[PDB]
Scaffold this active site. Sequence first.
Site, PDB file in Angstrom:
ATOM      1  N   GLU A  35       0.882  -1.216   0.000  1.00 32.74           N
ATOM      2  CA  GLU A  35       0.000   0.000   0.000  1.00 32.74           C
ATOM      3  C   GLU A  35       0.895   1.234   0.000  1.00 32.74           C
ATOM      4  O   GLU A  35       0.570   2.218  -0.657  1.00 32.74           O
ATOM      5  CB  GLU A  35      -0.853  -0.030   1.241  1.00 32.74           C
ATOM      6  CG  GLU A  35      -1.973  -1.081   1.186  1.00 32.74           C
ATOM      7  CD  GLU A  35      -3.069  -0.737   0.189  1.00 32.74           C
ATOM      8  OE1 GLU A  35      -3.039   0.364  -0.470  1.00 32.74           O
ATOM      9  OE2 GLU A  35      -3.874  -1.631  -0.103  1.00 32.74           O
ATOM     10  N   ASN A  46      -7.838   9.375  -5.326  1.00 30.87           N
ATOM     11  CA  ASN A  46      -8.637   8.439  -6.176  1.00 30.87           C
ATOM     12  C   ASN A  46      -9.573   9.218  -7.067  1.00 30.87           C
ATOM     13  O   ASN A  46      -9.821  10.395  -6.911  1.00 30.87           O
ATOM     14  CB  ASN A  46      -9.500   7.562  -5.298  1.00 30.87           C
ATOM     15  CG  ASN A  46      -8.710   6.784  -4.274  1.00 30.87           C
ATOM     16  OD1 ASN A  46      -8.843   6.930  -3.069  1.00 30.87           O
ATOM     17  ND2 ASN A  46      -7.839   6.035  -4.782  1.00 30.87           N
ATOM     18  N   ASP A  48     -12.777   9.072  -7.458  1.00 27.92           N
ATOM     19  CA  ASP A  48     -13.994   9.609  -6.836  1.00 27.92           C
ATOM     20  C   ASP A  48     -13.764  10.894  -6.032  1.00 27.92           C
ATOM     21  O   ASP A  48     -14.720  11.412  -5.397  1.00 27.92           O
ATOM     22  CB  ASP A  48     -14.712   8.556  -6.000  1.00 27.92           C
ATOM     23  CG  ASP A  48     -13.939   8.092  -4.784  1.00 27.92           C
ATOM     24  OD1 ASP A  48     -12.835   8.640  -4.518  1.00 27.92           O
ATOM     25  OD2 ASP A  48     -14.401   7.186  -4.045  1.00 27.92           O
ATOM     26  N   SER A  50     -11.822  11.092  -3.285  1.00 28.19           N
ATOM     27  CA  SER A  50     -11.321  10.721  -1.976  1.00 28.19           C
ATOM     28  C   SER A  50      -9.779  10.527  -2.089  1.00 28.19           C
ATOM     29  O   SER A  50      -9.215  10.506  -3.141  1.00 28.19           O
ATOM     30  CB  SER A  50     -11.973   9.414  -1.469  1.00 28.19           C
ATOM     31  OG  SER A  50     -11.584   8.337  -2.260  1.00 28.19           O
ATOM     32  N   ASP A  52      -6.396   8.424  -0.089  1.00 30.40           N
ATOM     33  CA  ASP A  52      -5.886   7.385   0.813  1.00 30.40           C
ATOM     34  C   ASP A  52      -4.654   7.898   1.577  1.00 30.40           C
ATOM     35  O   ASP A  52      -3.772   8.555   0.970  1.00 30.40           O
ATOM     36  CB  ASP A  52      -5.477   6.132  -0.016  1.00 30.40           C
ATOM     37  CG  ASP A  52      -6.643   5.495  -0.722  1.00 30.40           C
ATOM     38  OD1 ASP A  52      -7.732   5.594  -0.253  1.00 30.40           O
ATOM     39  OD2 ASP A  52      -6.363   4.726  -1.599  1.00 30.40           O
ATOM     40  N   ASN A  59      -8.890   5.344   3.565  1.00 31.50           N
ATOM     41  CA  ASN A  59      -9.635   6.227   2.654  1.00 31.50           C
ATOM     42  C   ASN A  59     -10.515   7.225   3.306  1.00 31.50           C
ATOM     43  O   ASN A  59     -11.220   6.925   4.288  1.00 31.50           O
ATOM     44  CB  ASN A  59     -10.447   5.298   1.719  1.00 31.50           C
ATOM     45  CG  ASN A  59     -11.048   6.041   0.583  1.00 31.50           C
ATOM     46  OD1 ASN A  59     -10.399   6.333  -0.429  1.00 31.50           O
ATOM     47  ND2 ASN A  59     -12.319   6.393   0.732  1.00 31.50           N
ATOM     48  N   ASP A 101     -15.193  -4.844   9.669  1.00 27.42           N
ATOM     49  CA  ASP A 101     -16.401  -4.284   9.007  1.00 27.42           C
ATOM     50  C   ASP A 101     -17.152  -5.320   8.219  1.00 27.42           C
ATOM     51  O   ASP A 101     -18.256  -5.030   7.733  1.00 27.42           O
ATOM     52  CB  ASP A 101     -15.982  -3.193   8.004  1.00 27.42           C
ATOM     53  CG  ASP A 101     -17.072  -2.165   7.773  1.00 27.42           C
ATOM     54  OD1 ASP A 101     -17.756  -1.795   8.758  1.00 27.42           O
ATOM     55  OD2 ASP A 101     -17.229  -1.743   6.600  1.00 27.42           O
TER      56      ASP A 101
END
Length: 129
Positions: A35, A46, A48, A50, A52, A59, A101
């Site tokens: 990562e 990203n 969209d 957003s 990271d 995110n 989650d």
Amino acid sequence: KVFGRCELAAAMKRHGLDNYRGYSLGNWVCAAKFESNFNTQATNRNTDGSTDYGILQINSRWWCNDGRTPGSRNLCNIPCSALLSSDITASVNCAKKIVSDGNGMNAWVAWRNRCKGTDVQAWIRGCRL
Ligand SMILES: [Cl-]
């Protein structure tokens, strides 16, 4: 700060990630390598809108607030900048929430494409743990 492999493994072990939700330590070190290349200051934007953040690329749509991701939840209740610190506590504590989650470590696309199903113990070989 850029961690060495074994230095990060020890830090993750001290903060309780080894076998957390059944994921051995090697899975977390492999996810951090792919990562962020073990760099706490890594950021990546990203498509969209957003971003990271940090060693585990957490995110801003869901987990932290960066003030520029409209309609985002801030499930970890932290500014995204806290995830860039040399102290990995906030990143680990938020990662425990993410791995709980429902989809486990498949939330980290580098883990699913580059670590899942590989010999992840190799990432901790040689280390004093
Ligand atoms: Cl990938």
